[PDB]
Symmetry: C2
Subunit: 483 residues, 2 copies
């Protein structure tokens, strides 16, 4: 009569069906245009306006996924996807999420599933030791790590913990004097966290960075701004140095910044959402030097660690600061209770993803995975440098190369040349790159991180960039870009 929506045999049959559907997708993803070519509003036209009253077959639904959903996808998993930062995935990460979705437990507390809490603390110590984090960040020592969804939520929680730590000493009425510090390259997640956490919009600082420092935040500039804020009656609270900025993969020097922060009793959060995973490699560990003097450190394992979206790894020195700000149990009372470390109460079993990746691939293969991305980007950088019509705009640090086509007021023309040039390349659907404007310079970003990407795809992307460079420069007139 009525089949249970979780019937084991129907789960088995349809599950095998979708596995085959997805394996075919990874096999054929290259045939699709990378950036979706549908028009806004395409899907509402093709779909009914109301839910169906009677059930539809999984066979019919899967066909609609092929005809209606897949065209409206920008294929982050395409090997020719080089936009933004990678949606780094893997078989192991996918299986860990499906085991998490299969068990479907709610990690509201330890008792709700003890493994969903204890496995998280183990793998965060695993990951932290591979990162060579100090014992002050590990359960092994005096710290701790927590898995979250995104970096914005992680930054939000460390910010409220920093806010509550200061306001509980000086009074809640001073919230309108707290200043949050970033660079003009810091990701929009910091400003959003400050807006949600009640920081005054006029008290967010995006400190100017300079080409002479490759747009990394100078501690000398940070101290100048703090003294200005202190003279204006404000209270410096929070600074967020970034390793691997999203625009140009700039790197803020953590140790000089923390030195300035301790003088003014400021919380330091190190944002390494993308590049942090590379410090698993000994030759890249120097990029987070000085993290031992910071209060919190975060990276997105879904960006450059194969887990699949989403898995944010947050290490803190003082988890009590998170609990004091995020727990709802009375202030006096304020086993691990992870819900008091983050926003989400109905936590997902995210540690399975990280556990699967670490076990299925091991430290050695994971290092070489990240190294292969960096090496393919180093090759792309070498190909650019051998073509005198191009220019590397900032030093490459982690697997992303920023470059621009040069023209054969001059900056505005060059910027327009690269916007048109990039746009014709993306319009082919053969590859996908995004851009950034750093120091007034419109530059193209080539971020090699898609798991399916091999050297032949990077070389193929170089061929298309060269062919389109031949096209635009061959018929170049500066009046065509002087508008």
């Amino acid at each position: 009569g009525v089949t249970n929506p979780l019937d084991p045999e129907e789960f088995r049959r349809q599950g095998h069906m979708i596995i085959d559907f997805l394996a075919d997708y990874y096999r054929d993803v290259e045939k699709y245009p990378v950036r979706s070519q549908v028009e806004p509003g395409y899907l509402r036209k093709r779909l009914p306006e109301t839910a169906p009253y009677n059930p539809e077959s999984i066979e019919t639904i899967l066909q609609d996924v092929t005809t209606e959903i897949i065209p409206g996808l920008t294929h982050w998993q395409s090997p020719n996807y080089y936009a933004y930062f990678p949606s780094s995935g893997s078989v192991a990460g996918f299986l860990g999420e499906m085991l998490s979705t299969g068990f479907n437990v709610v990690g509201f507390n330890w008792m709700s599933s003890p493994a969903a809490t204890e496995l998280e603390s183990v793998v965060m110590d695993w990951f932290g030791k591979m990162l060579n984090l100090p014992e002050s960040f590990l359960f092994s020592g005096s710290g701790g790590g927590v898995l979250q969804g995104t970096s914005c939520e992680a930054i939000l929680c460390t910010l409220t913990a920093a806010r509550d730590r200061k306001l509980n000493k000086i009074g809640r009425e001073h919230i309108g004097r707290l200043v949050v510090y970033g660079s003009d390259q810091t990701h929009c997640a910091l400003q959003k966290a400050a807006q949600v956490a009640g920081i005054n919009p006029k008290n967010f600082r995006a400190i100017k960075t300079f080409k002479e420092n490759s747009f990394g935040l100078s501690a000398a500039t940070l101290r100048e701004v703090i003294l200005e804020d202190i003279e204006a009656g404000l209270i410096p609270l929070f600074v967020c140095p970034t390793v691997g900025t999203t625009s140009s993969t700039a790197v803020d020097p953590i140790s000089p910044i923390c030195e300035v922060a301790k003088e003014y009793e400021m919380w330091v959060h190190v944002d390494a959402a993308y590049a942090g995973s590379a410090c698993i490699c000994p030759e890249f560990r120097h990029f987070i030097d000085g993290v031992e003097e910071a209060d919190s450190f975060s990276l997105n394992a879904h960006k450059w660690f194969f887990t699949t979206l989403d898995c944010c790894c947050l290490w803190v020195k003082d988890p009590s600061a998170l609990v004091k700000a995020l727990s709802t149990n009375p202030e006096y009372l304020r086993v691990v209770d992870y819900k008091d470390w983050q926003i989400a109460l109905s936590r997902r079993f995210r540690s399975l993803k990280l556990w699967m990746v670490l076990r299925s691939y091991g430290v050695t293969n994971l290092r070489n995975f990240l190294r292969s991305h960096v090496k393919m980007a180093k090759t792309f950088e070498g190909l650019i440098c051998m073509d005198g019509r191009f220019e590397i705009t900032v030093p490459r640090t982690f697997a992303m190369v920023c470059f621009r086509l040069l023209p054969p007021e001059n900056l505005v023309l060059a910027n327009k040349l690269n916007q048109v040039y990039l746009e014709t390349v993306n319009a082919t659907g053969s590859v996908y790159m995004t851009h950034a404007v750093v120091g007034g310079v419109y530059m193209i970003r080539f971020a090699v991180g898609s798991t399916l990407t091999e050297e032949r795809h990077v070389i193929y992307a170089w061929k298309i960039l060269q062919e389109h460079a031949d096209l635009i420069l061959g018929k170049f007139s500066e009046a065509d870009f002087s508008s």
Copy 2:
């Protein structure tokens, strides 16, 4: 040579293994004790202290899942799980997450995956119309809906939107005077949202409720507290009436609450995290009457709508109020294609619309209505068995598929509370069933929440049998001195 971590054939091979592993789990879940019986710290001692340098096989990991992970699980998917609220799942919803994790796109904006944005707006209109929400909550009309992870996140976003709307008019310096209003039964997600949003802790209100009103918030009591706050120089900002409270599934009357809230220009968010999905059935739609006068409305589709953890559904009359607070564009550009990241906290959004789309299509409105109805019937059946046993008592009216009850002794309250605490823990310790409790109005009561998808009538009857046999056991050897401590 090393194989690509996303190799299609290896994905196919290992994927089929997990599907078989999970199907075996659903087939055999009844054999495990529902509440995990491990000791704290068991896992750290069975697992290595460092990550392995060399790869391990999926067959080895899977065996470790069986011997190390599964024992440390409390099986929310067990048909004998009646604790808290359900972790409502289904085949269709699991497959939606599978396709979402398989495509693994990032819904940062419309261009990053147009389908990941447009499908969400379609299905939210689908669900909203199934809930008979007014057009002011739909994209067809004046409003819109957004999919988030959890209701606390959804309440936080809605609260900061209400905060910014007020503070943009009167000035940011008045944040220390804003007051957030809830009942003493309101879920702690509201208080957590107020703590994050910068609301002063002494300006959070947990207004007292009374057994005479089944612990629903009285609009007259709410108006009394507001006048006290106004007379004390405070600014009432935000009230969150609940349909289906967590402890006793109480329901707050929405219409008179917004009437009070309209008088003092307050934002109203209707929290229906658990019970909200039931109102797609016309005979339960009356429970959210008055939502036409609220500003926002939320339910957890992972709680009672089969998606899977997690899927929170938030409808708002004015999405621009969310954009004004959550956008990082400068304030003059927010002051004017959907960009869902500005409706919520998450920037790197997940393709959550697949889950909801899959559930709605694979089962349809009629079958989905009957799924929820069957849970209510089974709970009403459980309620009937309780009344026929004179040793038990129903403590609050049953509203949506959760029954509150307690064992009665042969103050009396302290002894009765201690009796039910011992009684409940002895039942949960068997591992045959799992139910949690709540102290409402000074009364310790046991909660029986029928929502796990695999739960059938035989499981509810089985749980009633377990409760009766323990009742016979506790009361057969009853002595007042055994509980008067």
